[PDB]
Scaffold this active site. Sequence first.
Site, PDB file in Angstrom:
ATOM      1  N   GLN D  71       0.818  -1.191   0.000  1.00 22.31           N
ATOM      2  CA  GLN D  71       0.000   0.000   0.000  1.00 22.31           C
ATOM      3  C   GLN D  71       0.877   1.278   0.000  1.00 22.31           C
ATOM      4  O   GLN D  71       0.604   2.251  -0.760  1.00 22.31           O
ATOM      5  CB  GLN D  71      -0.942  -0.038   1.225  1.00 22.31           C
ATOM      6  N   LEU D  83      14.826  -3.980   1.552  1.00 24.90           N
ATOM      7  CA  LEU D  83      15.472  -5.272   1.771  1.00 24.90           C
ATOM      8  C   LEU D  83      14.973  -6.270   0.734  1.00 24.90           C
ATOM      9  O   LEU D  83      13.779  -6.355   0.506  1.00 24.90           O
ATOM     10  CB  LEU D  83      15.114  -5.734   3.183  1.00 24.90           C
ATOM     11  N   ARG D  86      15.216 -11.603  -2.831  1.00 23.80           N
ATOM     12  CA  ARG D  86      15.951 -12.356  -3.845  1.00 23.80           C
ATOM     13  C   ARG D  86      17.379 -12.657  -3.424  1.00 23.80           C
ATOM     14  O   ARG D  86      17.946 -13.636  -3.874  1.00 23.80           O
ATOM     15  CB  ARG D  86      15.994 -11.570  -5.145  1.00 23.80           C
ATOM     16  N   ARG D 143      11.099 -18.170  -1.492  1.00 24.98           N
ATOM     17  CA  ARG D 143      10.300 -17.198  -0.713  1.00 24.98           C
ATOM     18  C   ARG D 143       8.878 -17.034  -1.215  1.00 24.98           C
ATOM     19  O   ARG D 143       8.078 -16.376  -0.551  1.00 24.98           O
ATOM     20  CB  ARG D 143      10.976 -15.822  -0.566  1.00 24.98           C
ATOM     21  N   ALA D 160       7.880  17.165   2.148  1.00 26.74           N
ATOM     22  CA  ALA D 160       6.749  17.435   3.037  1.00 26.74           C
ATOM     23  C   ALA D 160       5.417  17.560   2.303  1.00 26.74           C
ATOM     24  O   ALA D 160       4.353  17.379   2.933  1.00 26.74           O
ATOM     25  CB  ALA D 160       7.029  18.688   3.833  1.00 26.74           C
ATOM     26  N   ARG D 161       5.457  17.939   1.014  1.00 26.55           N
ATOM     27  CA  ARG D 161       4.240  18.003   0.209  1.00 26.55           C
ATOM     28  C   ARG D 161       3.709  16.606  -0.049  1.00 26.55           C
ATOM     29  O   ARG D 161       2.504  16.312   0.155  1.00 26.55           O
ATOM     30  CB  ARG D 161       4.465  18.688  -1.146  1.00 26.55           C
ATOM     31  N   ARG D 170      -3.683   8.111   4.274  1.00 29.25           N
ATOM     32  CA  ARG D 170      -3.372   6.986   5.169  1.00 29.25           C
ATOM     33  C   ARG D 170      -3.685   7.258   6.624  1.00 29.25           C
ATOM     34  O   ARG D 170      -4.038   6.354   7.360  1.00 29.25           O
ATOM     35  CB  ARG D 170      -1.912   6.625   5.065  1.00 29.25           C
TER      36      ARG D 170
END
Lengths: 220, 218, 212, 214
Positions: D71, D83, D86, D143, D160-161, D170
């Site tokens: 998301q 991270l 693979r 994985r 900051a925008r 969110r």
Amino acid sequence: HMKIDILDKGFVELVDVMGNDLSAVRAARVSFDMGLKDEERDRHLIEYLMKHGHETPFEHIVFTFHVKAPIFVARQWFRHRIASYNELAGRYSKLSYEFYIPSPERLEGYKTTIPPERVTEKISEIVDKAYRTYLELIESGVPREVARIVLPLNLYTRFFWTVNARSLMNFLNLRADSHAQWEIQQYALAIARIFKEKCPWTFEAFLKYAYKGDILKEVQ
Amino acid sequence: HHMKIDILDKGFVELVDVMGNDLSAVRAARVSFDMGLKDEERDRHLIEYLMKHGHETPFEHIVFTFHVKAPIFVARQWFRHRIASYNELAGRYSKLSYEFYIPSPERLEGYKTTIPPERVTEKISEIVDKAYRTYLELIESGVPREVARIVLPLNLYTRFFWTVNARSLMNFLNLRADSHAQWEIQQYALAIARIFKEKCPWTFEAFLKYAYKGDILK
Amino acid sequence: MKIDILDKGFVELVDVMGNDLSAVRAARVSFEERDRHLIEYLMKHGHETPFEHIVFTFHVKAPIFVARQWFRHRIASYNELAGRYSKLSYEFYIPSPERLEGYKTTIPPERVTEKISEIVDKAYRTYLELIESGVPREVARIVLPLNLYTRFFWTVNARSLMNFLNLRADSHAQWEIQQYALAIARIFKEKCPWTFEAFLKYAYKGDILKEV
Amino acid sequence: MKIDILDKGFVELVDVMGNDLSAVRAARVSFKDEERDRHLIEYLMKHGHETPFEHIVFTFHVKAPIFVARQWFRHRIASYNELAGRYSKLSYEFYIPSPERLEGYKTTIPPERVTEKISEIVDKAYRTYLELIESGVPREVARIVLPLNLYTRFFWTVNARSLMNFLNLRADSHAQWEIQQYALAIARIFKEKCPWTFEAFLKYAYKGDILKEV
Ligand SMILES: Cc1cc2nc3c(=O)[nH]c(=O)nc-3n(C[C@H](O)[C@H](O)[C@H](O)COP(=O)(O)OP(=O)(O)OC[C@H]3O[C@@H](n4cnc5c(N)ncnc54)[C@H](O)[C@@H]3O)c2cc1C
Ligand SMILES: Cc1cc2nc3c(=O)[nH]c(=O)nc-3n(C[C@H](O)[C@H](O)[C@H](O)COP(=O)(O)OP(=O)(O)OC[C@H]3O[C@@H](n4cnc5c(N)ncnc54)[C@H](O)[C@@H]3O)c2cc1C
Ligand SMILES: Cc1cc2nc3c(=O)[nH]c(=O)nc-3n(C[C@H](O)[C@H](O)[C@H](O)COP(=O)(O)OP(=O)(O)OC[C@H]3O[C@@H](n4cnc5c(N)ncnc54)[C@H](O)[C@@H]3O)c2cc1C
Ligand SMILES: Cc1cc2nc3c(=O)[nH]c(=O)nc-3n(C[C@H](O)[C@H](O)[C@H](O)COP(=O)(O)OP(=O)(O)OC[C@H]3O[C@@H](n4cnc5c(N)ncnc54)[C@H](O)[C@@H]3O)c2cc1C
Ligand SMILES: O=c1ccn([C@H]2C[C@H](O)[C@@H](COP(=O)(O)O)O2)c(=O)[nH]1
Ligand SMILES: O=c1ccn([C@H]2C[C@H](O)[C@@H](COP(=O)(O)O)O2)c(=O)[nH]1
Ligand SMILES: O=c1ccn([C@H]2C[C@H](O)[C@@H](COP(=O)(O)O)O2)c(=O)[nH]1
Ligand SMILES: O=c1ccn([C@H]2C[C@H](O)[C@@H](COP(=O)(O)O)O2)c(=O)[nH]1
């Protein structure tokens, strides 16, 4: 719609395209207060732009694709920020029993302790277990957005991808290449085939002058 | 398709190409729920919904290419919209034509001026002409075009191609189709809005109704 | 840090986030010989995203025609001085005669220079006259030449800054913006010497930073 | 500044360029005066003149489950480094909701059992993963059996925008609860480093519902 099958249940389908090779020619030519000329001069201009690194003219060619791919593939894919995406939502939809199970040939070139058939088996087992649990949680009243967290990364998702030819060529450079994961290489081969059919002059010039990957020079 | 709208004295906005239509947004949005198109009622409703709730990403799948002829001072403001693609006529490479925006007298409407507006107009065309003739003399003398052109004023017309999606285009309209924007770019923004309305009537109608932040379109 | 460019222009460093170790931490996702080695490695292999976590803010005074070329770099942030609102200052880039070295010209170079100053002066005087008559500034300023100086803040990450240097610190770019690019490069080298060194050596596509 | 989130998550401030005055300097184009500088910040925010806020930039280090990261990473006006499954052997770290995550939802089994069921599949998938790895199966393939609640770690560099857009979307009750919790952490840090911008944001531009209530 042009539709190419990838992996066991995956695909890449062309939904729409704006423009063609000549969209790049028209855009480049404005610099010199010019427009289109002959087929020969226009195709050679495309080659000129590609050989000298003039990339902006190709932003005026745009494609929309419809893609079905495992989440681990989509996660790599969606790192390409200069593109627009809309994706099937595990928060809002009951997800289907559709998972990528590698074929035994996937493990060609790796010395393996257990037969490839057993690797394939063990992947399937986790998949069935996780999916059963997912359905059990949903049936119990567990919100979908929580229930789905037990599902494995080989779950298939679907998305629309709208992307211009310049960004598409960056994608091909990085994904149609033996360093990218084999699974995404397969998707990038299908993207390349659709690109070549719609924009043959740009594609051929790209391969000849600008493309940095390895596989598209090997695989028609 | 093909649409063209003339702006100011010598400028224009021309629609060169378009990808998609209102249903392109409906389809992209519906994938969220594992769905596609439905009926006109439910699909028009969805577009209003998306616009009401600020779900703007589905509109990125609608894409336009315009061909624009505009004064440099207009282009300079326009090209501040970074979420788009541009290719422009190059003073470094082209022998530039004698085309300059000369405001009409009416442009000073509401402004009390010390000299008749027609005189303002006159003074502008005089300086433009002197500047241009100097540019040509330098070019004829062998001065590289990239240097000669620096004497040319900001009302020189330039031409460019602009590829932009419906979401960025709605941002452009919120900012430029507004009284606080300079009248000259307002006029271009009005033409962009007219073309948008024609190709994506549901999206445009919903935009005006639910999301549009400016004052001149309403 | 400030570098004078052209007759009246400059580039000054306003702020910077990070150093070469910012890219090293991003690449490793955590938190001297092996760290510089990783920087060259990333650079050699085209792994550019780690350099996005180094960011600079410049303050730049430059002729409009230079700024128009500059502002085509979309992956960055700009704030520029308003001509619609501000009375504009009498400052214009007048080329030096030496700007026309190489070019066999029918008018002596010093005379070209003079012809440019003349237009600038007449244009500025017309602008001022219009404003005095009550013509709004946003209309009056349209007669001002493309060599008028403007100022802007530019905030850009090292990756986009390397793309800027590939394109503008190069002999195909207009000489005037090349000079600006040389200044940006010098500041970049000051703050990020390992990245800059590896950039030149492995990734930089231009020519003039190899010569100067 | 490091804030723990979920069961094994965190948001850590790595760096910052600028402060509220960086937006003021950019707006004025000039390299102070508290009330008039705050007033400008509010004016910009009120009239949607948002470009000056792009000259304040943050780097975070975030640990989060892949379903949250997927998301997060849809925020394209930002920079990311993550991270890699693979190349690295993945750690036994997965997000398992607390029973209180599902209290409120009428469920046919105890929430405690929902936790147990989730933990059970995690454990089974991880075991298979390790087996396949031990067998010689490439990490990249092994994985694929790991579930979406696996923890990942990334660096996030955002201005900051773009960070205020992220908070709009969110730090809001329509976003999944898990990412809300991260957004609250992001907001706290943003409030600390840029108090005038954050206050002006809440007062004039913020379109969400949680940050005004918490
Ligand atoms: C073999 C391989 C291994 C990889 N391994 C990892 C890994 O271990 N960890 C990890 O996190 N990612 C990894 N990636 C992803 C990689 O770091 C990029 O996120 C991804 O390839 C997208 O690349 P891009 O930025 O070039 O494309 P886009 O994001 O689409 O950008 C396109 C172009 O625009 C530019 N651009 C767009 N946004 C910015 C910006 N904000 N700043 C500066 N320039 C910008 C750049 O010029 C870029 O080339 C890997 C990719 C490959 C092919
Ligand atoms: C409650 C919630 C539900 C969601 N559900 C879904 C879903 O079901 N399916 C799905 O696919 N996604 C979904 N998303 C993700 C959403 O569609 C966006 O991808 C995400 O919010 C990032 O938003 P953004 O584009 O504003 O941010 P960024 O990508 O950071 O972009 C920031 C800003 O720049 C602009 N911008 C950046 N790139 C472009 C571009 N290429 N064209 C035009 N403008 C651009 C816009 O102004 C945007 O506000 C959901 C998000 C939320 C908060
Ligand atoms: C009336 C008026 C007066 C103006 N006065 C001035 C002035 O005095 N000085 C001046 O410099 N400019 C001025 N501008 C220009 C203004 O600051 C913007 O550059 C311009 O309006 C483009 O808007 P945008 O950034 O929203 O659009 P775009 O740059 O196309 O971006 C579209 C959207 O994507 C996002 N976005 C794109 N890139 C980034 C990024 N790097 N970081 C974060 N978010 C991003 C934002 O959400 C944005 O809304 C003025 C504009 C208007 C309409
Ligand atoms: C010598 C020279 C001559 C030039 N002549 C002309 C001319 O005649 N006419 C003209 O119009 N311009 C001209 N330009 C400008 C040039 O076309 C680019 O606009 C400018 O160089 C910015 O480059 P950029 O897009 O790589 O940088 P940015 O715009 O900052 O983008 C950085 C990188 O991110 C990517 N990117 C950002 N946005 C997109 C996008 N929407 N789609 C795909 N990728 C994207 C690309 O990877 C790009 O390299 C010239 C530039 C030079 C150096
Ligand atoms: O609240 C949401 C819902 C969906 N998505 C995006 C993320 C994924 O790319 C895709 C589906 O996410 P999930 O619904 O599966 O979480 O859409 C979000 O970004 N936020
Ligand atoms: O209405 C405006 C005023 C300014 N600017 C931007 C464009 C230039 O980069 C700079 C100065 O523009 P002028 O005010 O000089 O037009 O700010 C705009 O985009 N629109
Ligand atoms: O070397 C160049 C030539 C052109 N342009 C872009 C900037 C303008 O938007 C347009 C015309 O530039 P001039 O040639 O007129 O500078 O093309 C550049 O950025 N760099
Ligand atoms: O070949 C790769 C490897 C990694 N990543 C990005 C995607 C994820 O955001 C993160 C980790 O990917 P995995 O290695 O776990 O696939 O790095 C890619 O885009 N391509």
